[PDB]
Amino acid sequence: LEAFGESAETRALLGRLREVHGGGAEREVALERFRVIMDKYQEQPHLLDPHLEWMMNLLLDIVQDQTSPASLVHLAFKFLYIITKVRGYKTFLRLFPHEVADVEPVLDLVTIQNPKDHEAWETRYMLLLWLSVTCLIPFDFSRLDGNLLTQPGQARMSIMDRILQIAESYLIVSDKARDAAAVLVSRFITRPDVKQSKMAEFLDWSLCNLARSSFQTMQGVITMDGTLQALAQIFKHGKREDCLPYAATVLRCLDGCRLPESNQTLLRKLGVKLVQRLGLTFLKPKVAAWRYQRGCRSLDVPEGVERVIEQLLVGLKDKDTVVRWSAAKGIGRMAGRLPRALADDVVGSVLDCFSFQETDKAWHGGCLALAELGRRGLLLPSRLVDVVAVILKALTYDEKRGACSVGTNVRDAACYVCWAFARAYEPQELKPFVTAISSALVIAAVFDRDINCRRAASAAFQENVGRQGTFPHGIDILTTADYFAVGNRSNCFLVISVFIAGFPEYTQPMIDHLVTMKISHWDGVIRELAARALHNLAQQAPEFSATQVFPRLLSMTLSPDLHMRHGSILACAEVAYALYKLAAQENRPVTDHLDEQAVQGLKQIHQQLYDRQLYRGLGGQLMRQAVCVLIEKLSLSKMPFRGDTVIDGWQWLINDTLRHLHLISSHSRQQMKDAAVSALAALCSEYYMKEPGEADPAIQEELITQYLAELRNPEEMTRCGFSLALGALPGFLLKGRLQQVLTGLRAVTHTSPEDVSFAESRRDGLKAIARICQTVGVKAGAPDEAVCGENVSQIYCALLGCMDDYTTDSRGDVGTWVRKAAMTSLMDLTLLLARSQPELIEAHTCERIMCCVAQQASEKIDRFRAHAASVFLTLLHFDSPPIPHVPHRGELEKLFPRSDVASVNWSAPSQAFPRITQLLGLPTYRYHVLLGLVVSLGGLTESTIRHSTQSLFEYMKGIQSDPQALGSFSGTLLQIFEDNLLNERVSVPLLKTLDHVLTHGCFDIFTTEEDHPFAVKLLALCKKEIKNSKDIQKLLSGIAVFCEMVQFPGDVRRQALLQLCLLLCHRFPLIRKTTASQVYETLLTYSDVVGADVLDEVVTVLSDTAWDAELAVVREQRNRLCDLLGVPRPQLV
Amino acid sequence: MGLLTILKKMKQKERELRLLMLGLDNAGKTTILKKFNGEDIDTISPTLGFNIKTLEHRGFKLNIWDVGGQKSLRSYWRNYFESTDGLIWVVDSADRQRMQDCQRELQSLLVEERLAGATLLIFANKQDLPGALSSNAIREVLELDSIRSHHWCIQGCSAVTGENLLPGIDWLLDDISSRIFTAD
Amino acid sequence: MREIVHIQAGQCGNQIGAKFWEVISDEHGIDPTGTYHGDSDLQLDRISVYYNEATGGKYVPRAILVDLEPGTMDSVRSGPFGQIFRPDNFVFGQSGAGNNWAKGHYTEGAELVDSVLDVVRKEAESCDCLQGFQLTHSLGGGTGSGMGTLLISKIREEYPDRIMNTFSVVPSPKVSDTVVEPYNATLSVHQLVENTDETYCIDNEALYDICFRTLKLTTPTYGDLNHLVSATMSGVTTCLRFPGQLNADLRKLAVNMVPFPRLHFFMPGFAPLTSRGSQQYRALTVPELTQQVFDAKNMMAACDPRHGRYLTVAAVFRGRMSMKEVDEQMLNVQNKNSSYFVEWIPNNVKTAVCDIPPRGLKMAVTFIGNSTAIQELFKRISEQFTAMFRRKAFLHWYTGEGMDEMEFTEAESNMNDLVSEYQQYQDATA
């Protein structure tokens, strides 16, 4: 935000507290609205300064009114506390009234408060603060009291005694008001007259409370906390010569409270805080003589001092981050007012915290103490070699302890120390350590994994550049790397990294740190990021990357550590790729940079790894992936390894990786397979090539024969691997034997009686098939080399053979995965020809493809219904050039404007069903869209079915009146019933759709005619479908369609009544009861269905007969009902 | 607390200052405070305690605390020394008899502990009067050359006409910005 | 395993957390002071599962109040039962996270997680054998979502083998009017499916509809929302706070209600529905309670159980009644409404009885279900997320804090794959 925009709303809400205080119905909503409006300025409370003066005047005028009830004054105290916690009490109470006349009234209010009223605690809190504001008056309390002996006997209590009693009573409550009392302790006991009459008493009571309180009970702890807070406030806001005569007695009681051994972290912090205020009471404040000459504002000793320093040093080694910071602040404050020689004695102790590297807490405390000492300029030049050295280790503290890493606090404290160094020393006495400090912060600002550490390092670098100006290229590294640019880690590791390394002052150390730390990280993501950084920084330093870093990595690739080996292999591959890219831009080979030494090691990475069976196990999977990536990079960089055993070894490893993918974690599987096919595509295009556009006959006969003989394996993972290994083959190696590979994948994407559950095989088969069509391209008269007209028809047939592939296996429609891949294969086929030989795109095949796509664009699966719509839009709008035969391409364009297509969420049913239903108007896609709408309407999701029914009802309104429209759609739907009968996929959802359509009242014009062909055939279809069943959904769905079709008069009515009477005596009593209920409903709903005044007896015998009895008892009732309705009685054999 | 929050708090505290206004009664402290803000001068009454004001000047948030210069109030001045970045000592030029008393008062304010590191701006108020002492007279009678632990600078003014008031605050801000500001 | 540490992040989480503690204290007889004053031994037979024994026979809570601002931290400490907690268990900052997941997960949260993991190890140190964790936060608010999901990840990285359970409160446009709540919600899911083991879905739209239509309220407040959330929490944890053989520990409850790693979102339900200042003298029978607990109106989520298939169902009946009648009613409900139950996980409906009914009610019933219909609660989020992300609106708040579009893409993909898996498992062997 920028300013306060909700001014009128806040004013009205504040002027509404006088009509929403009695009942709480409009009291809670107002508070909620106020809190929601005030929370928006929680991070920018400075933007409320110009509004917090008039809001406090309105809030004070309500509480100051004597006719303002308790409920009304308490409401005004909650808003005040809200404003205080929003803006801040220090900045809010300062503007409150502070006159003399406001001394007696306010106090009186504090006297009429119940401490046991949790429903109005906000009143007891804020009020106290207001009192503390009325103790900043320069008069005495005796002058305001006047004459106290005005009443007989009972004397009046002075204001000082009342305030003292109130403070003593509220420093021992559990609520937030104790804290407020501490504010009054720093405003009342620090006064000139109150101190003279309420300092010995208040200090004797506090000592007694500290002496008789335990940290093992709930109350005692509260009293001790309150007393410690009061003592800290007294020693802070109090004088040194009024409080020094008591600091030895207090120190003793504090030490006696044995707090450093309590498990109360807040008591220890208060004790440490009280230990530094008492200590600063033993020494006079000093002033930094070193100011006014090192930067602008913007951009004798008592014996107790030794004990205080010892306690602070002991606290530095605490487990909590709060006590460590408190002790560091105390040490800094103490050192800020000590001699120049004795102060050093403290530094020598802080260094002792860096003895053991495993104690991260000690290192953090030492770094915090060093930062606090440097911020005040209390560190001598002699301590630069010992301190700065440590800091260079603190900026790289990142150790692991199993599953949880450590060192984020250490590196954060290292940045604060570096920032403080900007003002701790002078530009002349920090010269021999500028380069080391600068590059250290540079490595932390671009290469840390935590954003906090990166931002801290950036801030430290900016401070050092602004206050010293001795950092090489400070302005450049400060303008590019800032609070915004440093936010991104990828940019810092790839973009900003190269810019910072462009200079010769950051090329060697950056690469060294990347190679000896970041590459050997404990996270794969960090290792990949470091590898990419080294790659990007390998074009600014080819000599250093090919002469000092490459050999450095060749020795680490053989280390026992797995992560180190992986990182070294990645770094070597990246360096080789960068050197090859650099040599390509100078018409020179890559062997010039990579000497014989490099060529040898690179030709020994895969061989040595296999010698130690390192490729076995989970750890061996990462070595396999690294070797695959290395082989891919070497083959893409064009290496002189043609005709060597290294190529045979690489072929073997790739073949083994795919022959054992079922032994790979499903989570990290798809990756290891797309990493082996990619490596195969580069190696077979740089080494299997005898002449331009050819290949070794011997190498082409062994590979294809081996891969086409593995597409029929019994393992599915091996089938998929070989399928993708056959879709990556180069075009020079498919020339002459393309028809064989085509016939092979066709069988790999087919479904036999034994390959019913091989859904993943067809996916990769179709993926590979289209991949080979796009490699070989289209060519006239070339069935063995490219896509001609002699092989275009078979591919289309194979692609459209997988469309009718719905597999409801244990998981569900695994077929959706095969039905998805096919949708892509066509998307890459019809398009490819459209960019070369669009004539091959037949009319019937294209129409069938467009129909299948429209059908798939209406399923019950939002994910796959969003892909189908995208594919359809990509194949309909295509105008570069457009598709030759698209049924209704003008209507489709008008219904799907290219402009309003990119903003349509097809994944959401709401923004997908209303639009896909409009395709019914096209007779070509009418059947295929109605089938989809039917299979989607009979699902189970509420939103999907609702959106489908809404679109169907909004569409059938324009054809219900038209007879021929209701005579074409009805026929199409009855053809889908004859097309999908006993399928069990379309039969169930088609019955539910028919029942819903009949209940809505759509086929009404046909009900007037007797024995309409539509119902005549629908009854036969229902008889053929519902007959012989088991599941209850089909039976219930069939009984609904029957009782809905009963409405049609004629002989169809009698046949439906007979079928209902038959189903009444189903094998399951539940089905019998359901049929009876539906018959009663359809009898009491419609009219003229029963004549001769025999309906009364029918309904009576239906409501009286118990359908939950046996069959021999209900058969007689069924026969009686049939005789009463004029229906033949079925026989019993 | 991390370094980002520490820097944020330091920047927030750097944009806040404290200017304690002191001086003998009947000197013109309330008049100067009202003229610097633009309020009315015909309706000003002696402070029965101490007044507080907050404003923004050159992006800096200035909080002025005008304390009464009465005899019974000086003893309470110690209650306004905590966190003091500037001390505006007002001196009446026409007041020539009580000068000795105004010299002892400013001399003791300099030997304090909390007021050690804080700029000093002395305003010679009521300069347009006939018997108004000059700047050199007030500088020599109060012994300003002996001051060495604080950066002082005398400068006459006149709240009745609002003259030489902006230069004083400008110099105070320039002197405050010349030194480094560190939290505690 | 016999001690559970409680955590609560964000304002709503802290408020929901403080209400549940008050409810379990009133049910166990623990007055605000901390001394036992109930009237049943069962209240003390399982008191060490959430409380700690201290001098004077006192029961100290085991919760940790966590926030980035001080408002909620002062509101709970000053509440009627505020004194019960530990003064050093309140860990909060000053600025908040401003409805930004990034600010609460990478800056203020990333800085306060250090102190948060200090009190957490303080509670785990005073536990003979830690059993798990129970966090209470919301997926809408920035601080409540970001830093709280940052505490789940830190606990999963630190403690290797420990159960993780949360009470995620899904926001709703009907309650709040903040535009960046869809993003703050989706990302959270992307973490839960890959971090938390158990997660209860408490949609705010369902609570609003139950308070505005069923309880008849012209202006349902956050006081009414906390009245429904605390009762649900007390009902779903009644087995862990009292003796029992079905789900006495968290590991057994997880093994019985988590058929798959990613699928663990349980929509809770409680009956009879009540409100603040309302006493229903009529005592509903066991059949009526069994029929009302399975009704979609009594569900805390905006999903209809009928439009889906059940996977794991756990019912609890609190009140003096007979076990044979409850078993017969459960069998009848399973037989009649058999189409709404997957037949590929036999014995997937558990029933338990307790002799400690809630306060103010003689007969109560609970429902913790794992139906695939819960996917509907995510589809709604999907639409909003996609609609707001395609035009790039208010995205600079995230990209400017270290995040990027890759995270939103990843979270959208994970959530979308969770919906597809739910739909597939719902139609298993169709």
Next chain:
Amino acid sequence: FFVATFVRERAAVEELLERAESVERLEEAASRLQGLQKLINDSVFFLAAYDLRQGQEALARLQAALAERRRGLQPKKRFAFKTRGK
């Protein structure tokens, strides 16, 4: 085998610490703790959660014992100013 060698090394470290009376005793003992930690952090790609928790607890107990032994054998003197060192 991993659990076996971990238990063996833990028992060896405990026996060495139970008889630690030199800085070389404690310094060698503080290099077996580094090795164990390095081994465990490099084996969390195939170990269970209960075993990892047990190993973490054992490492924490051993570190606490080593810290106690270092504090006992080497009692750090209290703080004292360097005035009049000789």
